[PDB]
Subunit: 193 residues, 2 copies
């Protein structure tokens, strides 16, 4: 029996397994099945394994050197709350071109690892981080595919609740490794509306 | 404008870009093109970027906590030479089931990261590492596909010289990150005839 970070039903209730109508070759290994309504379903066993791995991966960096990126609206709150807990830097909303490549921009930063919400939406950040040799972690849905993403977290990266539980779990596990008290609830990470 | 770790011609002479007659969905994003003879060609730009990232990541671990695994014969020497330089542990030849999951087994170890030569050949190690939450790094050829590999290094992982230059580069970059002198030639890493 596999031991999940949370009861399996919690993952399903959050809709992390709900993909899109599109499947990429890169994501096939994470797709459990395709629903009759054409929607692809992600493997929660794989998601759980990847969240654990990502938490360990990220705990190998000093907090301030971690940069989270997310233009997608429902990801802003989860990203900011994750940062509140982990101590990572973040950029939500429009990512300004040159933020990682132009030392003269006021927004310029030099993180050692970049974590984006969606490689398609946050493509500018992914491309720049890769051009500068910075490892890229990313949430990838069935429709995503990027040769520039180094560490993948296969999950619904669009749903309000799905994003809340994933960022919440990542922050929770990183805090555990760090021996930092964490009492936040999934609701605390969830975007309004 | 990209800057390779070594003259591009060196990568080609080693045949790292030469894949097999098969292409998985997992590897599609790394395939540059398909040759006249049916052989898929890997993207050396991505390989170079990935070797750089893997070296950085691995240098984030106490060397003794890194475990290299390789049953494939042409990978033994490269793996042993990499370990000589890096200080990592390794298991070449048959990987005994239970090595990462059975504490009573004499060969039992608790590495913090596992790096295998081929996820199909070294599937036992990949499966066990994943089952215990240990991040998995792997060399993946066009024919490979594994949801259990966390960090991928897209390259020919069968060729004698292909393996020598890849392990050589990784070791060189890790030593460089440490400052450790590195005077080995690619030949010093190549399996004998
Ligand atoms: Na989705
Ligand atoms: Na990248
Ligand atoms: Na707690
Ligand atoms: Na090959
Ligand atoms: Na794994």
């Amino acid at each position: 029996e596999y031991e999940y970070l949370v009861p399996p039903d919690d993952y399903l209730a959050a809709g992390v397994h709900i993909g899109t109508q599109i499947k990429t070759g890169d994501m096939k290994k994470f797709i459990f099945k395709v629903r009759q309504d054409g929607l692809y379903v992600l493997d929660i066993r794989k998601l759980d394994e990847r969240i654990r791995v990502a938490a360990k991966f990220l705990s190998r960096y000093e907090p301030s050197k971690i940069l989270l990126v997310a233009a997608r609206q429902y990801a802003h709150k989860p990203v900011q709350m994750f940062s509140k807990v982990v101590g990572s830097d973040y950029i939500v909303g429009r990512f300004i071109p040159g933020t990682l490549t132009n030392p003269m921009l006021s927004e310029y930063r030099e993180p050692e690892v970049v974590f984006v919400n969606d490689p398609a939406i946050d493509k500018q950040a992914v491309s720049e981080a890769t051009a500068v040799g910075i490892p890229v972690v990313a949430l990838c849905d069935s429709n995503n595919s990027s040769a520039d993403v180094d560490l993948v977290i296969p999950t619904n990266n669009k749903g309000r609740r799905a994003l809340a539980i994933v960022y919440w779990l990542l922050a929770r596990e990183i805090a555990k490794i760090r021996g930092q008290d964490f009492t936040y609830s999934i609701e605390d990470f969830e975007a309004e509306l």
